[PDB]
């Protein structure tokens, strides 16, 4: 039986800057690769994001990573970061969420 090769994390898809009207939902998504599989965490202006009704975080076996914000408010207007790390290294991608006020 063969095993996967050890490779530091890397994103094949990175998160994108978004503009969302206040009150509506917003989602950041990216895809990570690496072996051992990496552990992932999200940051809002470099502060760890904790799972909640407001911040839904998903990470599946295929490496799809996402952060969904259900009702965007002023406090969400920020820089978000998805960081992935395994024993061989780390990878991060960042993007801005601009909350639009009509």
How many other C-beta atoms are found inside a 10 Å radius of the C-beta of residue 53?
A: 7
Task: State the structure-solving technique.
Answer: X-ray
CA dist., res. 37 & res. 31, Å (int)? 12
| Parallel/antiparallel/unpaired status of strands 78-86 and 89-100 | antiparallel
- Helix, strand, coil percentages, rounded to 5, for the chain: 5, 60, 35
Class of domain 1-102: mainly beta
Order of strands, sheet of 89-100, starting from the edge strand that comes earlier in the sequence: 18-21, 89-100, 78-86, 39-44, 47-48
């Amino acid at each position: 039986a063969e095993e996967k090769p050890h490779v530091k994390p890397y994103f094949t898809k990175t998160i994108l800057d978004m503009e969302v009207v206040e009150g509506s939902a917003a989602r950041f998504d990216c895809k990570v690769e690496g072996y051992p599989d990496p552990e992932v965490m999200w940051f809002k202006d470099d502060n760890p994001v904790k799972e909640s009704r407001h911040f839904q975080i998903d990470y599946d076996e295929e490496g799809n990573c996402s952060l969904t914000i259900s009702e965007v408010c002023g406090d969400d207007d920020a820089k978000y970061t998805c960081k992935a790390v395994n024993s061989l290294g780390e990878a991060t991608c960042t993007a801005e969420l601009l909350v639009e006020t009509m």
